[PDB]
């Protein structure tokens, strides 16, 4: 069920002058479509949906962990925090980091977090526990976006990233309410409207978190999609260039998704 309907996901790479990893799954029928998908991409920001997760799962244990106050100085401050930034003053909740990183991408945010977790082999063990063996984080941002070619830190497959996005949002890896929250900050996300969402049908919900690494053409999105009338779909769709100064392109991964959805039978 593999590939079922080829896709010119090779001329499409070629057009953009790198390479595209693509994983779609139908949790409907099984059916999937995968190119590179077992090939490792950087994470770019997108680690911080499964950070997001992971400080979900750990609520199940330690109850008020999500209204936890967290108050942070100037030098946790880097480039990119626009919601961590305007709270600076006055701190935020563990909730509220949680959804800056996701939803705005705050860089901030997102190390605040990793630190809670017990830094990047800590969210790196979480993976391990709903049975990743791919993904690894290694360090911390922003020097995780290095995107070095034939560098495996901070990286994960396209296949892997669907595969725990599944488990997270519509398997059991987390308690139904959790499930849920972290399906709202999905959904609740800013940053994807060029991407994933823009092969998807406005009247089709959506959830995606984004990265976008700044060097070696390298960004990608993941999302659960959920069609009208039939099975959600996930998918992950990760991309890089041979170059430093290679730029990426959003079209290129809406054009992915497209193909896929396409690929999967999914009439759009
Ligand atoms: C996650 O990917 C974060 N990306 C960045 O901080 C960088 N962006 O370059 C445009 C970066 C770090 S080091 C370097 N030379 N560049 C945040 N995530 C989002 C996203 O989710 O796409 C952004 C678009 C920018 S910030």
């Given at each position: 069920?593999?590939?079922?309907?080829?896709?010119?996901?090779?001329?499409?790479?070629?057009?953009?002058?790198?390479?595209?990893?693509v994983?779609?799954?139908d949790?409907?029928?099984?059916?999937t479509?995968?190119?590179?998908?077992?090939?490792?991409?950087?994470?770019?920001?997108?680690?911080?949906?499964?950070?997001?997760?992971?400080?979900?799962?750990?609520?199940?244990?330690?109850?008020?962990?999500?209204?936890?106050?967290?108050?942070?100085?100037?030098?946790?401050?880097?480039?990119?925090?626009?919601?961590s930034?305007?709270?600076?003053?006055?701190?935020?909740?563990?909730?509220?980091?949680?959804?800056?990183?996701?939803?705005?991408?705050?860089?901030?945010?997102?190390?605040?977090?990793?630190?809670?977790?017990?830094?990047?082999?800590?969210?790196?063990?979480?993976?391990?526990?709903?049975?990743?063996?791919?993904?690894?984080?290694?360090?911390?941002?922003?020097?995780?976006?290095?995107?070095?070619?034939?560098?495996?830190?901070?990286?994960?497959?396209?296949?892997?990233?669907?595969?725990?996005?599944?488990?997270l949002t519509?398997?059991?890896?987390?308690?139904?309410?959790?499930?849920?929250?972290?399906?709202?900050?999905?959904?609740?996300?800013?940053?994807g409207?060029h991407?994933?969402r823009?092969?998807?049908?406005?009247?089709?919900?959506?959830?995606?978190?984004?990265?976008?690494?700044?060097?070696?053409?390298?960004?990608?999105?993941?999302?659960?999609?959920?069609?009208?009338?039939?099975?959600p779909?996930?998918?992950?769709?990760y991309?890089?260039?041979?170059?430093?100064?290679?730029?990426h392109?959003?079209?290129?991964?809406?054009?992915?998704?497209?193909?896929?959805?396409?690929?999967?039978?999914?009439?759009g």
């Amino acid at each position: 069920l593999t590939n079922l309907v080829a896709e010119p996901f090779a001329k499409l790479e070629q057009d953009f002058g790198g390479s595209i990893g693509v994983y779609a799954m139908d949790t409907g029928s099984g059916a999937t479509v995968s190119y590179r998908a077992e090939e490792r991409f950087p994470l770019c920001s997108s680690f911080k949906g499964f950070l997001a997760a992971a400080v979900l799962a750990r609520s199940q244990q330690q109850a008020g962990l999500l209204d936890t106050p967290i108050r942070y100085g100037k030098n946790a401050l880097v480039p990119w925090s626009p919601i961590s930034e305007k709270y600076l003053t006055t701190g935020m909740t563990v909730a509220e980091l949680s959804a800056a990183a996701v939803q705005y991408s705050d860089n901030a945010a997102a190390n605040l977090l990793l630190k809670e977790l017990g830094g990047p082999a800590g969210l790196t063990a979480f993976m391990r526990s709903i049975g990743d063996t791919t993904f690894r984080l290694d360090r911390w941002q922003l020097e995780l976006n290095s995107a070095i070619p034939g560098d495996a830190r901070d990286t994960s497959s396209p296949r892997a990233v669907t595969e725990s996005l599944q488990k997270l949002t519509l398997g059991s890896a987390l308690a139904a309410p959790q499930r849920q929250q972290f399906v709202d900050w999905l959904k609740g996300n800013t940053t994807g409207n060029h991407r994933i969402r823009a092969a998807v049908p406005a009247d089709w919900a959506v959830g995606d978190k984004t990265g976008t690494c700044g060097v070696y053409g390298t960004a990608n999105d993941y999302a659960v999609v959920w069609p009208t009338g039939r099975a959600p779909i996930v998918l992950a769709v990760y991309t890089r260039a041979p170059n430093k100064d290679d730029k990426h392109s959003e079209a290129v991964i809406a054009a992915a998704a497209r193909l896929a959805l396409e690929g999967l039978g999914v009439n759009g």
